[PDB]
Design a protein around this ligand. Structure first.
Ligand SMILES: [Mg+2]
Ligand SMILES: [Mg+2]
Ligand SMILES: [Mg+2]
Ligand SMILES: [Mg+2]
Ligand SMILES: [Mg+2]
Ligand SMILES: [Mg+2]
Ligand SMILES: [Mg+2]
Ligand SMILES: [Mg+2]
Ligand SMILES: [Mg+2]
Ligand SMILES: [Mg+2]
Ligand SMILES: [Mg+2]
Ligand SMILES: [Mg+2]
Ligand SMILES: [Mg+2]
Ligand SMILES: [Mg+2]
Ligand SMILES: [Mg+2]
Ligand SMILES: [Mg+2]
Ligand SMILES: [Mg+2]
Ligand SMILES: [Mg+2]
Ligand SMILES: [Mg+2]
Ligand SMILES: [Mg+2]
Ligand SMILES: [Mg+2]
Ligand SMILES: [Mg+2]
Ligand SMILES: [Mg+2]
Ligand SMILES: [Mg+2]
Ligand SMILES: [Mg+2]
Ligand SMILES: [Mg+2]
Ligand SMILES: [Mg+2]
Ligand SMILES: [Mg+2]
Ligand SMILES: [Mg+2]
Ligand SMILES: [Mg+2]
Ligand SMILES: [Mg+2]
Ligand SMILES: [Mg+2]
Ligand SMILES: [Mg+2]
Ligand SMILES: [Mg+2]
Ligand SMILES: [Mg+2]
Ligand SMILES: [Mg+2]
Ligand SMILES: [Mg+2]
Ligand SMILES: [Mg+2]
Ligand SMILES: [Zn+2]
Lengths: 36, 154, 90, 56
RNA sequence: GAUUCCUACUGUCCCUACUUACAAUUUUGUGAAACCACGAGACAAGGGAACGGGCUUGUUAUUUAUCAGCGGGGAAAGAA
RNA sequence: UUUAACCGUACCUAUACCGCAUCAGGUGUCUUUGUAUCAUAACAAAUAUUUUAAAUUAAAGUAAGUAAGGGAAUUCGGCA
RNA sequence: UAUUUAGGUAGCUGUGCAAUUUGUUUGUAUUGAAGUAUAUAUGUGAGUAUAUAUAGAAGAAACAAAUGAGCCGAUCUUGGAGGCAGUAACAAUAUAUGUAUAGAUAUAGACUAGGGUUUUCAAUUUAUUGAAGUGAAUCGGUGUUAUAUAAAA
RNA sequence: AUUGUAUAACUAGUGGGCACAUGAUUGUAAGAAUGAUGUGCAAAAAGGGAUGAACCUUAUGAAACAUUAAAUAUUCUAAA
RNA sequence: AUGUGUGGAGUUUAGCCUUAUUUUUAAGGACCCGUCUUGAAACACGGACCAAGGAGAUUAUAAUUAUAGCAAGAUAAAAA
RNA sequence: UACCCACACAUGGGAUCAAUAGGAUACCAUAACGAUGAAGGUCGUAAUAGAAUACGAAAGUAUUUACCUAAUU
């Protein structure tokens, strides 16, 4: 019904740097049976 | 503005309260709130204060792989138990707010009972870390929604 | 070493501003711009096909050519003091 | 076909299709130059060589 | 730099024993990755693409649904 | 003597530089108190930072110690 | 009037269902079109038709036409979200009244290269906003040259 | 014995094969290599050889009822 | 991919086909798909999960088959 | 208590359908730069101003046109 004031509530400041941390590069740039 | 899954038969004598997207871990608040339903409201606040001072434990039932055994979990016929701090303080703030609306609407505090308790998942907040050989891995966290309704006894 | 231990020694700066192009590609020892080749009169031909897009004619301000196009479509407004004077030329 | 991509080759646990080179953004490392790639050209592009009129 | 022998010396060995600190075992907070056809319990022999977790005849486990170890197997994982 | 023009004068020396980072790595020069019978090593001044789970009890690890009698019989080799 | 014929990998031919746009004809809709979710009937099958809930503005059928015209796979492309798992790996000084009494670890301070407001103060909780702050005849550059463009030691 | 026979035009796939019965060449011998005649698997269902690409009965749309073949009749398992 | 409420089975066995109102059970059948291959359930390779995208279309020159107009002749060559 | 199934209600995500001050192709007209200082760049100007956009000490709505720039005593 109603939400109240609390110290565990969300922040609008954290949402600004959150989407900044969501865009990067996904992909980037004695063996078996050895004889001579 | 999360809607409740509770079906209200009488609009009087039903008190609801709500916290949306709280900054507490989801898997730990689910473990604490499994035994709060069908209790008096006064017995709940006394029980949650004993978890903070480590006198009563919480029985882990769903997510319980790798929990230490203890003797305080014999009261639930169990063998595993833990005492989470920060999850109990978030649930205590919800139960005090219900007690304040009851004295404003003039209801009797002893007659109330907990009726509908559910929590659910929430959108994530992303993060970062830097590992060995120069690789980058995600480090995000997972909040939850908390929904609690209280009803008078007959 | 070649890797992390040798990246501490990089604290010397070689390229500075150019007068003609505005990029940071003017060598201070070779005394030449690496993008416009500054001390020569003619400008350098660009390196690729996309490089002709980035600074073409018309992405600027066009302080003069905006006027010249506008007198082509509509006629030019004249100064009446100047118009009387030009008729008195031999 | 505007970019300048090239295949990276085998030995990297990745496909053979051409990858966008460079760095510094989310774009670098994605596929290009194929009909099954996103923002890539289609195979058999249409053209104005097609016969538009018949003869009776 | 490469090789052999004498003297001294010693837990390298006969043959191992005892003490302390830091990680580990127990609690709170922040909270990932490799890998994944299906995996719902495990064996003996048979035939088969001539070394089966599943197919065919036989012999068999089970603490209210755990916790801490260990490196026999998954012809274990990496790299057309 | 209405004589001496133009530009920079805050702050950081490593948690305010470079290594994708509040990274045990790297980076030019100078100064710095007292005991210290060759010095070295070590300790103290000066100055700057810092707040709250359990414990005589695991196994196997990473470091530091001691060992009756024998003295290279261990091992490719006195490797440690 | 199949009392005679009917399996089938590679492969060849015939009859049919699904999608987007174009000409002509017929018709539906704010007492509710397109989409989506559950049932029922029907077809050997690709599929079709109807009923109930939700939503709010345009869509269907017949005779002919044009193709960017039907996915389980390509170590396929882009986005979203699992198991392993609250598991590995890291952080965790004392006081009954305190702007103090103690404990603990680390040598410290100036010029240049690099950084550019991080400086100082106020208000709200290593953050956000707003003001203030750099004063030169004698401290650096601007000057001379290193045998036809060179020095902040 | 056969109601047709004969003639043209256009075009695809394939050119690494293996097994059983009869009889051979090389080799001490091989689930070895290479030829000859017939039929199969490849591309072939159901029933039986416990299980098996090629062994034995046997020609092909959807079903119901009776008769046999191959093979079996202590029990698993229909049948003295 | 998850949360809450109500109802139901058992602890010795996931999912599928046939026949049954003992359908949260019983008797028979039944190794995981795609692909090279003489031969694949293979101790041969690719595939953890959903949505959307994704590969014999166009043009020139010849030939055969079907259709339409005229026929000892046939034709929208550029242009007007 | 955990594991499995059936139904009803709520989270998570942006697929489907409908719209559109955007693009693509063909045709027609034009085919006008600069020492009388071009194209391009750097710095400044708003009563309370950051991005974008317009403008030169006559500066955020018929004249002026800061400094480099072929840049030219
Ligand atoms: Mg553990
Ligand atoms: Mg790390
Ligand atoms: Mg690094
Ligand atoms: Mg150097
Ligand atoms: Mg140099
Ligand atoms: Mg495109
Ligand atoms: Mg410890
Ligand atoms: Mg076995
Ligand atoms: Mg065998
Ligand atoms: Mg274990
Ligand atoms: Mg290879
Ligand atoms: Mg100063
Ligand atoms: Mg200073
Ligand atoms: Mg330094
Ligand atoms: Mg450091
Ligand atoms: Mg101990
Ligand atoms: Mg000894
Ligand atoms: Mg001794
Ligand atoms: Mg010896
Ligand atoms: Mg020996
Ligand atoms: Mg030695
Ligand atoms: Mg057929
Ligand atoms: Mg297509
Ligand atoms: Mg798909
Ligand atoms: Mg396929
Ligand atoms: Mg992906
Ligand atoms: Mg630690
Ligand atoms: Mg500040
Ligand atoms: Mg074949
Ligand atoms: Mg058979
Ligand atoms: Mg047999
Ligand atoms: Mg019988
Ligand atoms: Mg069976
Ligand atoms: Mg082979
Ligand atoms: Mg095998
Ligand atoms: Mg292999
Ligand atoms: Mg794989
Ligand atoms: Mg599709
Ligand atoms: Zn330049």
């Amino acid at each position: 019904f109603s939400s109240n004031y609390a110290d565990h509530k969300i922040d609008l400041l954290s949402v600004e740097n959150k989407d900044f941390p969501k865009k990067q590069k996904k992909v980037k740039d004695n063996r078996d049976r050895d004889f001579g | 503005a999360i809607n409740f899954a509770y079906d209200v038969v009488d609009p009087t004598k039903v008190i609801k309260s709500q916290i949306d997207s709280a900054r507490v871990s989801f898997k730990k608040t689910r473990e604490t709130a499994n035994t709060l339903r069908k209790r008096s409201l006064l017995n709940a606040i006394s029980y949650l204060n004993n978890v903070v001072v480590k006198k009563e434990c919480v029985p882990m039932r769903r997510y319980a792989r790798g929990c230490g055994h203890t003797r305080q979990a014999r009261a639930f016929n169990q063998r595993k138990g833990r005492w989470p701090k920060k999850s109990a303080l978030a649930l205590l703030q919800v139960l005090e707010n219900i007690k304040e609306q009851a004295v404003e609407k003039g209801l009797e505090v002893e007659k109330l009972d907990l009726d509908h308790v559910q929590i659910c998942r929430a959108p994530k907040v992303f993060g970062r870390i830097f590992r060995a050989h120069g690789r980058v891995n995600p480090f995000n966290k997972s909040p939850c929604h908390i929904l609690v309704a209280a009803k008078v006894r007959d | 070493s070649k890797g992390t231990a040798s990246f501490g020694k990089k604290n010397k700066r070689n390229h500075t501003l150019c007068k003609r192009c505005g990029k940071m590609s003017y060598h201070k020892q070779l005394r030449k711009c690496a993008s416009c080749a500054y001390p020569q009169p003619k400008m350098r031909t660009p390196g690729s096909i996309k490089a002709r897009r980035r600074n073409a004619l018309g992405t600027g301000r066009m302080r003069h050519l905006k006027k010249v196009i506008h007198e082509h479509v509509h006629g030019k407004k004249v100064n009446p003091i100047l118009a009387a004077f030009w008729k008195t030329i031999k | 076909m505007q970019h300048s991509a090239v295949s990276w080759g085998t030995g990297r646990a990745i496909a053979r299709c051409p990858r966008i080179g460079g760095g510094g953004s989310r774009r670098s490392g994605q596929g290009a130059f194929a009909n099954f790639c996103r923002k890539g050209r289609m195979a058999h592009p249409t053209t104005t060589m097609r016969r538009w009129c018949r003869k009776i």
